[PDB]
Every structure is written in structure tokens, then in C-alpha cells.
Amino acid sequence: GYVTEDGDTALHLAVIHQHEPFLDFLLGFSAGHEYLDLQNDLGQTALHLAAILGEASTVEKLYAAGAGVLVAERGGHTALHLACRVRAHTCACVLLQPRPSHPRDEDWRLQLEAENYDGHTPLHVAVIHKDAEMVRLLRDAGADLNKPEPTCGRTPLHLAVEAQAASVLELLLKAGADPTARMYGGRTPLGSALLRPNPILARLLRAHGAPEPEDGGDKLS
């Protein structure tokens, strides 16, 4: 029953200070309760703070103790969303599987396509932060490689071209991302590539589909 001026409970502060002992203590009996899900003023939960810190062990303890994984902080970000922008691969691993439970699953999957207020799902973030490793992870976890972001319909492949991430582009390409998709304006991943300074990208796409674009010079005004 304690809150900081910023809304952080003992649990929040246990992770902020990184007190595995006290965190272990807290989770002693708070496990299986909504205490775990309390949000400070930034709308963050202990799990959220754990993700940001990149502490895989911490993330597992909370997750194992029944911590809600789909809770959203002020940016609509889920713990996993936070992990993709911090490159916390191992935390992602902890979360991207069934919750821990000894010899005393579609649920952990729901995290895969949850989206923040930027219309981004974990994958969108991963690809934007050119986090190739996080892409392999999400791809293997089964994330929608074609899912368009809402501001203009950009797909992972579109985001990969905007980031000029070749390894990412290629990973997405070999995984089966449709190189035919176009954003609200009609532009396709190959088309955007041509308007970018990295030749490798166009070649990669050429080698996996290469449907040559149109033109319509931005349809001038």
C-alpha cells in the first residue's frame, strides 16, 4: 500500500533499484494478484520497467508470478513493445512463450500483434530499430510479416526500406513478406527503395519479386 510521487509502488521501485532480493520478497505473496499490474503515472507496470531495463531474469520473475503482459503504458506500448525499441532480445524470449509454471498456447501469442498508439505492433518497432535479431525472434514466434501500419499502410518491408536495413529487408523477404503490397498512396517496397540511396535494397527486392513500379511522379500539384 505505498506509492511514490510518480505512482511507483514498492514493486516498481524494487525493479528501478534492481533489488532481486526485495523483488523476490514482494512477489512472495503479491503473486496472483492485481498488485503486479498497478501502473505508475507513466502508465507503466513493473513488467514495463523490467522490459526497459533489459533484465531478462526480472522479466521472467514477474511473468512467472502472473504479471499481465498486455498492459499499455502512456504510449500504448506493451512490455514487449518496450523490449523491441531497447533491443532486449532475451526479455522478448521470456515473454514470447507460455508463462512459467512447473509440473504442479494462444494467450502469450496475443502479444504478437498488439499495437501501440503509433499504430505499431512489436514487429513494426523491431524493423524500425533495424533490430534484425528481434525480427528473427518475432518471425519465429509467428508475427504477421505483412501487417500494415495505419498512418499510410506501410508494411514491415516498407519500414525496412525506410530504415535502409538490408539484412532486415532480406530476412523479411526470405520469410515470405509480400513485396507486392503498396501503401495508401500505391507505392510498393521496391518503389520506395528506388527513391533511397542504398542500391542493395532494390536488388534484394528484385531478386524476390522485382515487380517493377509505375511512376506517376508523385502526381504533382
Place this chain on the structure above:
Amino acid sequence: TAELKICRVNRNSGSCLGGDEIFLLCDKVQKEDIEVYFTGPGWEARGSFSQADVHRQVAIVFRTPPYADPSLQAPVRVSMQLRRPSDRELSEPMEFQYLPDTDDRHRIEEKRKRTYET
């Protein structure tokens, strides 16, 4: 008769209270004959802007209409699209989500959970 199309927008979410300034890039429109139509089951509303807010008939800066429910307690998906009053033509709908909003910005209620439900 041309075609209504929403090319890009800066954000696809906002407060269920409305008032969020949205920047929308589109295909050529007619400033005196166009609007931003928001829709959900049994619900319609339009963005607020004036002809002055229609840049080169290729972009519109308007503000979102408040949602039907102000005490919204969970994200709500709705539709947003360009509309011509002249022929009632519409553009391909686009996604928009209304979100709950800091009720009187008071944790006295958020803490009557962090202490009550604690």
C-alpha cells in the same frame, strides 16, 4: 468526378473527447466540397476545419470530433474517410481509435485502487 483518397495521416488515435489536430494528406479535392467523416455502429461525426485548412486541395488540417462516449474506458476502433457532399462519394476508410482520457487528471481515483485494491 475524380477519386477521394487518403494518402497519409500523422496519427490514427486520439482522445475520446475529440479535439486532436490531425494532418491528412490526400489526392486533389475541392475545399468547399469535402469533409472528414467519422463513423462507427450507429455513430457519425465530422472533423472540424474550414476552407482555409485545406492546403492546395491536397492536404487538410482538421480537429477530431469527440466520440459518442466521453467516459470511454477502453480503446474504440472507428472509421475515418474523405467525403464529398456534392455526390456523397466516400474514400476508402482508414483506421482510427478513440482512447479513454485522464478523467479530471486525478489519481485520487487511481490511488483508491493502489491503496484500496492494495
Place this chain on the structure above:
Amino acid sequence: TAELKICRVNRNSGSCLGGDEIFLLCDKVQKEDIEVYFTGPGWEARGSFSQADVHRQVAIVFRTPPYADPSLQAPVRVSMQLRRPSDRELSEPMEFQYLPDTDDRHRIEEKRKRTYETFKSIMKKSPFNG
């Protein structure tokens, strides 16, 4: 004698780390002959975007360049204008303000210090030992 002109922006401030997406509504421009030029005393930078980000040569979407100083401790107002590399033509200066960063890692760290004592107490007074 063509003329650069910024008509509207959706935001006039952002993080000193740069990266903020701005929607700039302007007068007819040449997608391959244009840029968003940020300036201050002895400092200049360009917004980032591709010709694929110019909408009908009358609007531009780019991301702010990072401010000269990342550990900015107070807001610093700079100028932002359209610049045509062709003949070096510039637009009427518009004000853009850089703010101290909102980093989450640091946001947590600054909060760690700021609450060391309070924490040392809660666990002190708690049934926990250690």
C-alpha cells in the same frame, strides 16, 4: 525568382535527440531540390526525409535533426526554414524549440537516485530482512 514558404507545421518543438516527425505544409517545391534547414549560433542541420516524402511538392514529412547538444538541460529556440540547394534560396524563418530529452532508461535512472532513501525505508520498515 521562385520563393520558399512554410505555411504550416503540426508541431514547433521536440526532443534535442531529434527524430520527431513533422508535417510541413508549404508552397510548391521541387522534391529533388529542397530541404528543411535548422539553424542556431554556429550550428546548422537538415531534417531527414526522401523525395518520396514530399507530397505533391506542397508538403513535406521529415524527422527533426538532433540538436548540437544531447544533454540539453533547458529549452533552446532555433530557426527552421525551407532551403533550395539550387540557388541557396531560403524561406521566412520559423521558430523551432529543442527540449531536454525524454529518454526512458535515463528517466528511470534519474528516478532511481531521486528515490534511493525512500526505498531504503520502505524495505527497512517492511517484514523483509536484508
